[PDB]
């Protein structure tokens, strides 16, 4: 059994932080790096669906990016979630973001 910090939201073993403000992709990653977290690393389809359902009507950066000629990689272009799925934009644009981290295990 497990918990998330109070401003974060839990979904199966992970915690996610949905931002108030907008940043570019690198400055969102810097922000998440502070929480010893990362721009959201979506490990499963169920997790993607969760973020799509929870996120609200704004675009949100996730931790997926691409150097030109090269494939998309999880932590050029950067990916965000819109209402239907993922899309790309230049990394200098300003969007809300999602951080992810493993949840806090509460030992017994
Ligand atoms: C993102 O914006 C920040 C301002 O917080 C700036 O320091 C950084 O260089 C920017 N990165 C870009 C424009 O790619």
Domains of the chain: 1-108 (3.10.100.10)
What method was applied to determine this entry?
X-ray
Going by alpha carbons, the residue nearest to atom 13 of ligand 1 is: 92
The three-state DSSP-derived secondary structure of the chain is CEECCCCCEEECCEEEEECCCCECHHHHHHHHHCCCCEECCCCCHHHHHHHHHHCCCCCEEEEEEECCCCCCEECCEEEEECCCCEEEEECCCCEEEEEEEECEECCC
CA of 92 to the centre of ligand 1 (A): 7
- From the CB of 24, is ligand 1 less than 6 Å away? yes
CA of 73 to the centre of ligand 1 (A): 21
CA of 71 to the centre of ligand 1 (A): 23
């Amino acid at each position: 059994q497990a918990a998330c910090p109070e401003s974060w939201i839990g979904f199966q073993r992970k915690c996610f932080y949905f931002s108030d403000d907008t940043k570019n992709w690198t400055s969102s990653q810097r922000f998440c790096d502070s929480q010893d977290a990362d721009l959201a690393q979506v490990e499963s389809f169920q997790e993607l669906n969760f973020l799509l359902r929870y996120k609200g009507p704004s675009d949100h950066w996730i931790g997926l990016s691409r150097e030109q000629g090269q494939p998309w990689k999880w932590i050029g272009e950067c990916a965000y979630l819109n209402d239907k799925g993922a899309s790309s934009a230049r990394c200098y644009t300003e969007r809300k973001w999602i951080c992810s981290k493993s949840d806090i295990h509460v030992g017994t």
